Specification:
4 copies of one chain form a homotetramer. Chain A is α/β, with parallel strands linked by helices. Chain A has one domain: Rossmann fold (3-Layer(aba) Sandwich). Helices cover 43% and strands 17% of the residues of chain A. In chain A, strand 5, helix 6 and strand 6 form a beta-alpha-beta unit. Chain A is globular and about 45 Å long. Chain C: Its EC number is 1.1.1.159.
């Protein structure tokens, strides 16, 4: 099975809770040395210490992905601690339903958060994945980059931009041996309203962050060695 | 024939040359009063004067769509000259192939020009279209919003963002009686041409009047129940 | 102003009611000579007579699109009265929610009715459009060729096949001067809190009239769409129903 | 780890050589009892006994998926041999460029081979996956179900129909605990025109059948337990033209 991450160094952003924490833990179990980062230093340090206790190699840092100070800090810290960069999980991001008439300061924020930060991070990491022989980029998107709904003028445009950025920079950094893929998570179990939302999920249950973690582990692994420019929706079969 | 634009006021950005100029002319022939705008005052004024000579109502303005001063100026000038806003054709834009290692500022410029400008323009124009009993917005995207290619890190992401912005803000301004659609133009007329036509099954390149008539359909009462759609005018292939 | 239908002969299949009748009538107003066909001859004859009453050129025929005898009859038919074929609207189709364990003959039926019929009709009509100088093929698909939902194992597959067949045979009959486009209609109008519930997902706050699909088709089969081919236009008011 | 298939029974169709052969050999390493089937008994028997020699559980039967004779035969043979059905890999397909003016006996072929077959197969397998507590159906499709090209009147329509049939019957058999996914492979390794097709493949190399085999293993494993109605393109990041 080429589903292990041995000799891998994986930078996981927004990885103190939820999908990022699960991705970091599962990647570490797979043999990858994990640079856990978050907007909060305390959560990232906690997750990294938990990983080290489990028997893995990890460090914990504070990173605001929108701050190039912090981005170069994370890149340099990964290089100092582990010597190379081979996996970049851009899970950091946010945004939500904003009105059509929103202040433009919110529209620009949605793209500086969900898109600009991760593109700059991929720019920063791609050269180090090149003398490393190749790497894997994984941007964690959302199901709003494909679906059309109200109040999604900022979030949805940003997530679809993430998707097509994946599909396109698959072509630029391919020669570097780098694979760009994305994961679109659905409803994650971090109640008649819950069952009403399950009525459109054919598998009859909500997803666990382990689902996203395993999809990511596949996409970042040598098993996905000839997979690039792909958005994989983990939704149980619906919206 | 509900393919006329009588009692219509159409703002057309980047309309001194090419697709925008042909859209302005075709919309004026359809009976619409056209606020031609451009980054260069002289071209917009020339196109507007030619339209007025041909027998239509038009004005010409300088507008950097990235400048909110210019945007409010165009909105107020349209409301002064013609009393209402019913059609907004965001043809203004640009960018192109930039390297993956491009300076970020390039990546922010691609979106401020190709996305943020037209979203702020739609924001400014939506209340007046609602007041005027509804209207139509048409974003002039590019085929890079769908295709995947090299050097398209910023252009492709911005264009797919325009596509999904169209699809989604069709839902917000729908209740206002506003339809949002987008045109993706192929290769435009203005042995690699033979590769172009190896791809284009119709064996010829497209004239700006093709995009003009597609826009005229999408901004006319004949498309009164069409919104959230991206029409690709490529002759049936990719160039 | 290329939205006029002069010197055109359109074959509109399933043109007795709804989208088909609206398409036949609006094409005839545009100046096209309309071969109205339907599964029944009385409905097609009623629509054709009504178009001739409006002041258009129209004939009415019985056609089961799955019967090649009927297909050849319709081609020869229009061909004998008008002399040419320049437009082909494949609106004739059917099917709906069938279970996953459906009898496989039902599954073959979905494709024979919604796909094999219109592909054979396009095959027959391409030489004459070619011969004419140019032509237009418009396949009336469904929003189920794109959307994913229960009980659509046969209908959704067939309509997605229609969509991609459009996109690809746009490459084949391109050199003939023929354009292949598709229309995906939304919810059509023909104290309804379920109707308002389905309107909650339609941003324009109303249901679409058959005239909307009629005008969209008219555009796509018009000289104004002269450089448009291989495209599926969804007329849904901006949502899903 | 959930990248296994212990306590699994797999019906792979089209596995004398290529993607199906790799899928049968790789699913068996995951511990799955594999029912290797194909058009010729010789190749399916050969592959099946090779999975046996390595240490897996397998058999090799004749199956022409357009023949309901063989269709029920493989269902009842997998139950005879292993007792349950939990995984169904529909790789058996084929076809290619045909003229626009083709007969109905080429178009109908393409659809009875690429689509009707795997649908009847999924129909047959679904009640046993329901009986066995859920399972995975995996249709092998094509990049022509997304991309447009000349002569693709029958191949492209059929594979796009496969894509959408996946996306839709994900809703039908979901309640049964079944996940339906699809793989779209690129150019498979089995030259300078090769470098010309590689100029559109960013990873600068062609794909091996093990790539599709491992994407399939992921898509039919417990690690993809909440993934359904998806089409995964294994293409190296681009399209390859032959």
């Amino acid at each position: 099975s080429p589903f292990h991450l041995n000799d891998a160094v994986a930078i996981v952003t927004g990885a103190a809770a939820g999908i990022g924490r699960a991705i970091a833990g599962t990647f570490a179990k797979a043999g990858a040395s994990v640079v856990v980062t978050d907007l909060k230093s305390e959560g990232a340090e906690a997750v990294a210490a938990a990983i080290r206790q489990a028997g893995g190699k990890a460090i914990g840092l504070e990173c605001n992905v929108t701050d190039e100070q912090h981005r170069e800090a994370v890149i340099k810290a990964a290089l100092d601690q582990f010597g190379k960069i081979t996996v970049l999980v851009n899970n950091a991001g946010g945004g939500g339903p904003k009105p059509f008439d929103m202040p433009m300061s919110d529209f620009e924020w949605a793209f500086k958060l969900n898109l600009f930060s991760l593109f700059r991070l991929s720019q920063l990491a791609a050269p180090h994945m090149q003398k490393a022989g190749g790497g894997a980029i994984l941007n964690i998107s959302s199901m709003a980059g494909e679906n059309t709904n109200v109040r999604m003028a900022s979030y949805g445009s940003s997530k679809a931009a993430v998707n097509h950025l994946t599909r396109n920079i698959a072509f630029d950094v391919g020669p570097m041996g780098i694979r760009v893929n994305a994961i679109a998570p659905g409803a994650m179990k971090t109640p008649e309203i819950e069952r009403a939302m399950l009525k459109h999920t054919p598998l009859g249950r909500l997803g666990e962050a382990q689902d996203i973690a395993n999809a990511a582990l596949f996409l970042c692994s040598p098993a996905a060695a000839w997979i690039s420019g792909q958005v994989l929706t983990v939704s149980g079969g619906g919206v």
